[PDB]
């Protein structure tokens, strides 16, 4: 009897579910239909998180671990959960909130997190992680920070990492759709979030974009996700049972209360629309509108085209 | 008719409202009754944000601005909203989410956020901000980054700042209770969030702590706030009208479903308890509990003592 709903927050005050950044656009990208299989920002409408998705905004694209010495003054990290609690293999693709970009270097800023180690001195370690590296092994709980500054960190130092920025590999552009390779030890419990395939009825997936310091990107500094983090947090909180084949949303201009566009959000946890032919679809709408639940609908409910025709 | 409620997320998956960090403790601190007047994490039960509080988790203690050249290779920043929207004086204490730590140096890591400036090259600028500096003028929209690296940043470059860590002033310890001096030009619309005075009936204010890289702190690397960010996001979303003098919450083991403690959350937007005398109050309780609304109550409802005797 718990009815379903979405947070009624304006889009442009909601946040990405794959980087800790404000949302400032929504787009569609039908043509370049490469695999859609993000591991963060994944949640069912009844509030089950998938892949590495956490409910915790402050964990999105953060990783934590203890240091050990690797060959050639590389700084090995034994991952734990950001909460500090241990990370064990064979249960999830990677720790909760672990970043899901596989196509470029991560330039990272870490601090120490042990209170005893925080009463004096500089707590910062900086470096970069290469998800294409052979020693990148997040499912089994270990990765390698190339080029650490400082060059020598004591073993067993507890470090919390942020992604300061992302950069392309040499002579490629950084594709933020591409998820990492988590390892080859994939148990059924630890399975990746499934890929999402195009929905039919002339619908196309809607991505919520963020401007983010992603250098040399295929998208010009824009990180897409399928769900605002606030939606994830909302579904996990509400646990509203699924009572239909999809959920029709209206994107409302909040003051004038007029309908700016029709969307469907599917039980698997992704949004779609029908773009007005030959136009940008939802991207031309004001980013200060609000999403409201209208009703459950069937998969074949036909959406009115959204946007202008170019 | 919209009934009041709190997010029913376990405390240790919710986040700080004054730094972007996971919560990992709740404490009381009666005796050292320094003024309680945080500007972030302030929100009424019917969802009116106060001081500099934003709803956007990814804006908590982040600031944005455009560079100009100040004397002696200092880096001046003309503040804007993190969204990019211009910041004007006389309306708010400071931009939304602006950090409210006055008692220590902020060591900051910024990136360029202009997409054209992110097709190539390193986009990082680091430095430190000194709230006690005479050029620290956040209400009027300007501050200075001391010791920038790089030393010369082109004028008018758009930079998004994070606080990597906080450090004490020399010969002092860093008190995270201390809010900045925002300026002298403080109009009525731009008034600070009021300070909170202890509530009577043997009650004391409950603080939600995070471990955070705050070096040399008076609290051993712990940042307190009055409300989890998720609460703020919840009250703003719900807009449930105030229908009593206080709201009684139970803190529930979400397994056993048993009552771990009684709390009141007041309309002005803070939580209290009655510590069992001679103990830490709520600090001994497990941190995986969940808050649930029971009923509105009057101010003189007497809470059962929380915690052990010590
Ligand atoms: Mg899992
Ligand atoms: Mg204001």
Residue numbers in the entry:
A (entry chain B), B (entry chain A): 231 to 540
From the paper:
Noroviruses have been identified as major causative agents of acute nonbacterial gastroenteritis in humans. Histo‐blood group antigens (HBGAs) are thought to play a major role among the host cellular factors influencing norovirus infection. Genogroup I, genotype 9 (GI.9) is the most recently identified genotype within genogroup I, whose representative strain is the Vancouver 730 norovirus. We determined the crystal structures of the protruding domain of the GI.9 capsid protein in the presence or absence of Lewis antigens.
However, the molecular interactions between host antigens and the GI.9 capsid protein have not been investigated in detail.
